[PDB]
Amino acid sequence: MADVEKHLELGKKLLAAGQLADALSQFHAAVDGDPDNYIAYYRRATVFLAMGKSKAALPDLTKVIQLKMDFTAARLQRGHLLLKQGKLDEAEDDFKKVLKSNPSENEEKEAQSQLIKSDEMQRLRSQALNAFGSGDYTAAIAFLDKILEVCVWDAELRELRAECFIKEGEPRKAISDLKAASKLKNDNTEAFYKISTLYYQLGDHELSLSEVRECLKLDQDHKRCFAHYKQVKKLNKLIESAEELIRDGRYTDATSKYESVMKTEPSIAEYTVRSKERICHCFSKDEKPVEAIRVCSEVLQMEPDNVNALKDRAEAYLIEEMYDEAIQDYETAQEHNENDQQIREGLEKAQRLLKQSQKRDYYKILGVKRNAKKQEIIKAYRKLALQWHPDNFQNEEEKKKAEKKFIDIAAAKEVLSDPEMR
């Protein structure tokens, strides 16, 4: 009908304008209106492909083919797709029938180049699995890395490689594949669960949560997903809230939410380690030096390179006027993060005070200002020197201590006469 014509035409304009989502809407309308119009099926597949929707394109393309078996450009299209999906054998059968069908000169060049690739894919697949079967994981990765340049939408193999990075002790390198695999399979809940937990495991709670919400959108009654859901949702509030508080500068509150974070997930180290960094942060930003040093130091026993923990402990040491240990920290921090304005401003501001503290102040032996007025000093000296005379002290060890204060008071008067003021 005219409708199916309008759907296709608006479909066309939209696609051309890059408007994939609504183009798809319209071809959907076009397919429903005339369920036997190969053009509708073809134009939809064309969008699906444009959108990365690998699974959805295939049944539409083979429909186009079922209806119009002479239409070889759709057979070549389905050829390409299946080769992306890593359904090699079938990708070969189409690429070959394309060649047996008076192809275009550009259709011959494609159908051929592809079979050439496909041949290597079959060898690389077999090497990949074989490597994997014997436990040669780094071997398997190298093969698979190559297959997946070409088979970019082989979910199964992506999964295998993720499993490789994992056995290798490199879990984070498996986020891409596992995320990809769930995207392609589209309505497989297990794929969302796997990616949701791998995220959780890495302390990626925000994603993990959103990613399991997907599982449950697919299956409301999925037991395992829901269990995990309760879990990360709980741990998400606690962490989100913890940080809300840290920005309000409610540090002891923040610290309490973090103790809850750790109590809610004890098994995974990252949730314990990262909580401690944040607690270390709370204490330091709260001017609680001994507590900062105690917690921050423990964080560094676990992660000696923790730039954030070093900055917070540095800050603690500054409070304690521990200028050496502050620089040592700001420095060992500067090693791991090369140019940080905060680190550098810390190292200079620590050094300035390390210098100024070694610089003896005769006024610091009593003077009201860097300029105590007139005979205020003479009043201070006579009393102090008379107070602090080793004669005063019967205790031998106590005396020797007065003496240093006496030499100090005396050396003060000596330098506070006439020109020696500067």
Numbering used by the authors: 34 to 455
Sentences reproduced from the published study:
The crystal structure reveals P58IPK to be an elongated protein, with the J domain attached to the very end of the TPR domain via a flexible linker. From the structure we can identify the probable binding site for BiP based on the position of the conserved histidine-proline-aspartate (HPD) motif which is necessary for Hsp40-Hsp70 interactions.
Finally, it was found that using this optimised condition to crystallise native protein, after enzymatic cleavage of the His-tag, yielded crystals that looked very similar but diffracted in space-group H32 (crystal form 2). These crystals provided the dataset used to refine the structure at 3.0 Å. The two crystal forms are very closely related. Crystal form 1 (P312) has one chain in the asymmetric unit and crystal form 2 (H32) has three chains. The three chains in the higher resolution structure of crystal form 2 show RMSD of 0.4 Å between A and B, 0.5 Å between A and C and 0.7 Å between B and C. In this crystal form, the density quality is highest, and B-factors lowest, in chain A, while B and C have weaker density. Due to the high density quality of chain A, all analysis is based on this molecule unless stated otherwise. The linker between the TPR domain and the J domain (particularly residues 402–408) and a loop in the J domain (particularly residues 425–428) show highest flexibility, however even these regions are relatively well resolved in chain A of crystal form 2, which enabled model building. PISA suggests the oligomeric state to be monomeric in crystal form 2, but identifies a potential trimer, generated by the crystallographic symmetry, in crystal form 1.
